[PDB]
Paper text:
Viral transcription is highly regulated, as demonstrated biochemically in viruses of the Reoviridae. mRNA transcription in these viruses is activated by external actions, for example, removal of their outer shell in multi-shelled reoviruses and binding of S-adenosyl-L-methionine (SAM) in the single-shelled cytoplasmic polyhedrosis virus (CPV). To reveal the mechanisms of transcriptional regulation of viruses within the Reoviridae family, we determined the cryoEM structures of six CPV/ligand complexes in the presence of magnesium ion: CPV+SAM (i.e., ‘S-CPV’), CPV+SAM+4 nucleoside triphosphates (NTPs) (i.e., transcribing, or ‘t-CPV’), CPV+SAM+GTP+ATP (i.e., ‘SGA-CPV’), CPV+SAM +GTP (i.e., ‘SG-CPV’), CPV+GTP (i.e., ‘G-CPV’), and CPV+ATP (i.e., ‘A-CPV’) at resolutions ranging from 2.9 to 3.1 Å. Like the atomic model of unliganded CPV, the atomic models of these liganded CPV all contain two conformers of the capsid shell proteins (CSP-A and CSP-B), two conformers of the large protrusion proteins (LPP-3 and LPP-5), and one conformer of TP in each asymmetrical unit. We discovered that the large sub-domain of guanylyltransferase (GTase) domain of CPV turret protein (TP) also has an ATP-binding site and is likely an ATPase that mediates the activation process of viral RNA transcription and capping.
Except for A-CPV, these atomic models also contain ligands revealed in our cryoEM maps. To test this hypothesis, we first obtained the 3D reconstructions of G-CPV and A-CPV at 2.9 Å and 3.1 Å resolutions, respectively. Our structures of G-CPV and A-CPV show that, in the absence of SAM, neither GTP nor ATP induced any conformational change.
Author numbering:
A (entry chain C): 150 to 346
B (entry chain C): 298 to 395
C (entry chain B): 298 to 346
D (entry chain C): 74 to 99
E (entry chain C): 100 to 149
F (entry chain C): 841 to 1284
G (entry chain B): 1088 to 1235
H (entry chain E): 1 to 292
Amino acid sequence: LSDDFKQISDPKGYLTYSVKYEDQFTKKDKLRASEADDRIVGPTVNLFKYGAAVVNIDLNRDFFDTATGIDLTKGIPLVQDLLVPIGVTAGAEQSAEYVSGLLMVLFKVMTDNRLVIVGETTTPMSNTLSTVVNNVLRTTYHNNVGVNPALLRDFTQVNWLNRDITNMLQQAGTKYGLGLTETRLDYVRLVKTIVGH
Amino acid sequence: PALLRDFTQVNWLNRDITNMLQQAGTKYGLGLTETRLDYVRLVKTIVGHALNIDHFAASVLNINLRALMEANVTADDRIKALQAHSMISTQFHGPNQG
Amino acid sequence: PALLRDFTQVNWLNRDITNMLQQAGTKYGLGLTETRLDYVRLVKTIVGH
Amino acid sequence: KIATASSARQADVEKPADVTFTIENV
Amino acid sequence: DDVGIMQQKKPPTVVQSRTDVFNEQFANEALHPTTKVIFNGLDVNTEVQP
Amino acid sequence: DDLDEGIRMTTYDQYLSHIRERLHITNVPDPIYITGASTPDQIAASVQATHVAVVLYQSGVINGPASTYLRENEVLVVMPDYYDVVSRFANANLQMNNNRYHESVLEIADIFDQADFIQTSDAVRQLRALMPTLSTSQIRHAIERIAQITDVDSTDYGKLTLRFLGTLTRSLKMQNAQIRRIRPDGTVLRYDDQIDIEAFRWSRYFLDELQLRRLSVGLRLITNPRIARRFNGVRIMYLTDDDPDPDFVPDVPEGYVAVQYAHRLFSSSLANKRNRVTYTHPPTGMAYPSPTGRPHVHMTINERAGMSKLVADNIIASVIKSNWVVDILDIEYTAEVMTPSEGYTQHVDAESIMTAPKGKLFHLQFMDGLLRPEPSAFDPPASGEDMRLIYPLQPISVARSMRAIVNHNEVDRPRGAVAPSSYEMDTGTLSRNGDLLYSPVANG
Amino acid sequence: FVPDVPEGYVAVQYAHRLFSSSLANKRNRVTYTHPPTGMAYPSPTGRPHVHMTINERAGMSKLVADNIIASVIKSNWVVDILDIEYTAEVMTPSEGYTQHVDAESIMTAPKGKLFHLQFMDGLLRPEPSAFDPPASGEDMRLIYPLQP
Amino acid sequence: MLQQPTGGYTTLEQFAFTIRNDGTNATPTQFLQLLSYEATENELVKKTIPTPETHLPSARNVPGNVYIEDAITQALFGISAQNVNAHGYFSRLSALALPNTSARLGLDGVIYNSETINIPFYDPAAVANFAATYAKLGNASTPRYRADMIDIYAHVGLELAGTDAERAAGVMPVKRAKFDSWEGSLISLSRDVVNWKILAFLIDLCSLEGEALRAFKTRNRDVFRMMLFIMSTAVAANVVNRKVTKRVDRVLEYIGVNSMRTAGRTATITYDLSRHEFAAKFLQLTFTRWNA
């Protein structure tokens, strides 16, 4: 067979949350979720922990690797020796690098032939989960949940945040849900059934 | 004993405790509660916890805290008690008076 | 001297040169200007700097 | 103790798909 | 809202020491926030009150 | 008239480059030229003929029924150039004016009805607008670079390897190229389904269908505001460090006068036995040798390039003493947003900001002071004052999803705290065809 | 030369009560409350033009003396300290200033210290050459006499 | 978009202002009944309020949904509010003051920069009117534009403590407020006032005209008086308890006299100097509007 696709499990996004913490802040009360709710909600909660100065949405440095020539330490993409002067060395920290970065982002995306395969999953029993999590969970879900601020609901000890998130999620127009879902493609076969998470 | 409810394997006890706690006149509750003193500051916010403790001790603790709360000692007080113990025209400086 | 424009610290000179350069009749340039590719190979041959 | 600051970013986990030999359905 | 307890990080504290006469110049002035302060001995609140 | 409303028009070069090949490829008559003698009905016959709503302008003033037909039907006039555009139109109300338009990109999808021949969007043009103009060798260099990153052996590409003439590099640039038959004379022939194969109809920028499907998503990615983290322009203003937010841009005060920086403003002069760097205020004409006492001035510096160190130090001195506000548009920069505990790891003297080479990326740092706990009641008063010079001209925190994840009190939100956007949590459904969607806003 | 107080400055007797520490924007700034309006001015930078007179330095907080000089600089306060006694030396331009009196010592010396200020007579100062480039910098004088 | 009722937004029960009276819900007016005043020797003459500066803060575009209501209410009534003079919120406010802006002020009190249809919001003409004045809260800190922090409180006294004769006179004795009270009565009162949607109040104050506005000032006088009460407790020189016949009576001295107290205390909320500037500016605008 031709290797048209790069089958992989538990996919990495083009974007990821970054987060800076002022460590002197710490809620005195210690929250105790059930082990299941910790298994799902937890990676989110450790990231958006109390005393986090700011959450950012940077491009995934892990995905746009140094293999693509891209640097991402400064918030922008950068690529050296792409758009350069001829007959002289390009100056260091040149602004043109940013534009180069964008091409190599776009290129690296135009050539992104990853094909998702279901990774390890869990099927928590409803009773193990606090109701707010069970309302979001849809039977099965990947063991490597990513983070999502919607998972902070009724877990963040930051009251105002929980209030705002609960509001946005009690709006008709927005519904967080995670895990397996009923796609139009359900039961379609291609050696194995397609499913959607 | 209110915590024995639906845990003590002594049936009659659980029955009696469940009765007393299903009465209007008695309501066990434990943990953080909304006191009239909520959000009041004294370097740190005051808060109230319903606690498993005898009502006398709780009364004395409330009395002490409320005593501290009402004292309104400020830096001006100490500055004044300093001036009283200092050469007649010493000037004092530093902290906000309040 | 046309390169002195907006680089020399001498004000009158920069003014004067700016005026001469802003005339219709005079325009400084630092070519390349005229490329001329071959009709067959299609690569540049004589160029006007 | 001095006040301090730290950073975090979500970890990558994107493995190549496992080759299982088991099958779930008849 | 709470009063800090751990030692907080602070802006660098340049001490201008203005005299009778001086030639003020502003080349290489810092752009970051900075504490101008005119006197040297400003640790003046010594006498602790237990 | 809204900026959207009015008569659309474009340059001929754009039409050749992007529109006309598609007309040729769709077997429709070439759209009519419009002269002075042009009834709207002819324009309608033309627009319905080409299925495109475009008319090349030929010559002469255009009569008003035709103009109003072009305005009401959003026909795109194509014109040789932009000189004296108004003279090309009759002005019954004289509302039209050469300076009164609104330039904007207009996607080909909005003109053509056939989706099969439309691979991209506005976003590519916007990206090209980000690029420096490239000499052909720079284009070849870029292509060889990308190839090297993708581990391709692009040696001898775009070259003749003649035995006697040596290697000869040809230009690689070929934007909007098509595969087309040529007459033996060497002149290009219009594409014909009768002889040329269907694959040659439209090159599709020479990319696979899958690469196009991903290219689209990528263009939506590159032109996201949140990725747009390279910033331009810095306001310099001597001011106390007050606002916690990184994104603060101090407003210019009521009394200031805007003044473009120019080398002509600054000069040597006598003043009390010293050759001081006098600045002459363009309105009053008055000369002020001293940085002290100058009129309040919102000076804009479009380019620092030739500026002398004397003048730069003097402008900074005016920022400090006369309280000038000096915006500097030349600067491009990145902005790490520090949190108070991590301090200011890097530093930038005013000298370096005035003398750094153009095209270098400055890396400024801006504290978010929002997570700074209140001072102890018994900490000694500050006799002095923390100050600040560098400010952004534009919002910086574009990448920021959330802020101050702590409680003011135990229940209040801190001022300036940022909740996550609702769309971060929407996970709606797949569209009927496959594409991602947000949930419906209302039931309907 | 004794510089004149510009029109619109407000005469303001110094007294210890005009200054106090006070909370403002998460810092305990040494605020000054202006006896006309009554308004407090937490920072030296925004303060009203003030011709403050200090009949006697004694008992003044050092932080307050520092804050006043800072107001002298950032709000252009004109502060006349009547307590000081000093001798003067008139330097010729050729000899330049051989001594300097820090404002710190002027605001913090015990009364009865005798200062020695020096002043340039600039009359015989050389004129700059006509074509010589301007130098960066500005000479400044913080302390002035009240008398010839 | 919620169309404004002819009597103003405050006629809607959605915006009812209420405070707990030792924990039971009550109209502000029935709390103000509890107050009683021991006059002292000093007088409060009300000076004319200087007309507010015409200059709005620049309508600079800013990231995020600014929460203007919580910002104002915290800066006026919250326990140790912070960064009350940060410019960004009022930059967005003045953005709301523009004739054809895309920004909306939701009933949530948040300023969304989208035309977000899902969240109901006040009529844009009304909030244009409201921001047209209240954006000036943005120059509470700038030296040029600072409001008097002392004499303005005289007005506060009159609108709170002042008898109708004293109010028409424009002069009243400095007064000592007092009431039967519970623990944390002043703090909890502020906590109740802070949850008030005062945007409905200010928007009605800026958008209503003629008979509607007059009816508004009459219907809402007690509300305004409660906010004024919370400020006066934030600035009262001293606040104490007087036991009397097994009933504590809270006493605040003095109404109408800003002590410029900045250091925090148990009895009441406290204004740091930035909060002082903010509240003073607030009163400048609000009283300028109230007396028209």
